[PDB]
Amino acid sequence: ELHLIPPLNFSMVDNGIFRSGFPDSANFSFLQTLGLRSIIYLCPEPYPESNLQFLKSNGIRLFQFGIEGNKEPFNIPDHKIRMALKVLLDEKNHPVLIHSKRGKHRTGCLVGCLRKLQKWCLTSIFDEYQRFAAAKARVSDQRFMEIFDVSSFSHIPMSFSCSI
Ligand SMILES: O=P(O)(O)O[C@H]1[C@@H](OP(=O)(O)O)[C@H](OP(=O)(O)O)[C@@H](OP(=O)(O)OP(=O)(O)O)[C@H](OP(=O)(O)O)[C@H]1OP(=O)(O)O
């Protein structure tokens, strides 16, 4: 009866936007229910054959922006986050799942930058980031969001969003 398994740290971010860690075959029946158009994948590692067959069967486009893992206190790639954000803000790509390995750091930073574009105060952005990152919350991830300059994205409409 209970049989659907969302991927690790799965959540709905907004209308047409999801976040998680790395899906495996146990999660495919759940992800099929979302009717995804796109995945934004933030790790450099090649997509496993299992996941590639799932994308092909379901007509899902893979956007890969490979952000190299780093541990505190040693550099979040502004350019890769911004390339991912440009794809995320295009409603033609929705519904879209953002994922990394566990969906805490790279995924957390991309979602936090979306919230800054949505005009959330920093403490509200950090609270949501911390909910997922839990004991692995990094000051460096929040600093990245704190200094992220919204200028180049500020004209992009979000009529997709629940938040008008
Ligand atoms: O605290 P560290 O510096 O030891 O981080 C560990 C690991 O934490 P753990 O050691 O408690 O298991 C992280 O997992 P969590 O903090 O998300 O639970 C993991 O991030 P991740 O989940 O892949 O990243 P997202 O998908 O969230 O972006 C990270 O991978 P990378 O930074 O991409 O290299 C690892 O670094 P290393 O062991 O050198 O490969």
Residue nearest to atom 29 of ligand 1 (CA): 69
Residue nearest to atom 40 of ligand 1 (CA): 69
How far does the centroid of ligand 1 lie from the alpha carbon of residue 75, in Å? 14
Amino acid, single-letter form, for residue 96:
V
CA-to-CA distance for 77 and 75, rounded, in angstroms?
6
How far does the centroid of ligand 1 lie from the alpha carbon of residue 72, in Å? 10
Buried b (16+ CB within 10 A) or exposed e, 88-97: bbebebbbbb
Residue identified by tokens 């890969």 is 64
Q: Which atom of ligand 1 is found nearest the CA of 22?
A: 26
CA-to-CA distance for 75 and 70, rounded, in angstroms?
7
End-to-end CA distance of the chain: 37
> Domain boundaries in the chain?
1-164
CA-to-CA distance for 10 and 99, rounded, in angstroms?
9
Residue identified by tokens 């799942």 is 97
Any residues with CB less than 8 A from the CB of 55 and at least 6 apart, and which? 39, 47, 61, 62
Ligand 1 neighbours (beta carbon < 6 A): 21, 69-71, 100-107, 136
CA-to-CA distance for 158 and 139, rounded, in angstroms?
28
Q: Taking Cα atoms as reference points, which of 117, 57, 59, 52 lies closest to residue 88?
A: 117
Q: Which atom of ligand 1 is found nearest the CA of 101?
A: 26
